[PDB]
Symmetry: C2
Subunit: 79 residues, 2 copies
């Protein structure tokens, strides 16, 4: 049971992820976020009972328009 | 005006940071955390007004002993 939710309005990006935690998961998520040129402005994340729940609010820092499915793809690749 | 607090108990690590937010701050912090081989298990972070507040609980993933001043120094450079 695992969900990836991406909400995009102009340059504002909301990310929610729920999945089974495994080692270095949070690191892969933030690597993905870095590689999407997303600037994180707030995060709540924890993994009680080995199940990660993550909520991130971010802003797009690169050039051009945001491609939401690319965000969704990178997160799914990270978990 | 900035505060960095690092607590180490065996392999558990608790980081708290308060400083002025600026662009890509969160990314520099997680870059630092990655390069310290810390596996992040929980994060609460936000910057209401321009002032970032951050609490991270992590576990050391590398070999050998944790070197606490390493963590605090890398965090200070990330600011």
């Amino acid at each position: 049971t695992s969900n990836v939710t991406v909400t995009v309005s102009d340059k504002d990006v909301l990310l929610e992820v729920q999945c089974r935690w495994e080692e270095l998961l949070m690191t892969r998520v933030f690597d993905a976020i870095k590689s999407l040129h997303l600037d994180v402005l707030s995060v709540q994340a924890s993994a009680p009972d080995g199940f990660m729940g993550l909520k991130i609010r971010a802003q797009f820092a690169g050039s051009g328009a945001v491609v939401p499915w690319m965000i969704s793809e990178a997160l799914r690749k990270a978990i």
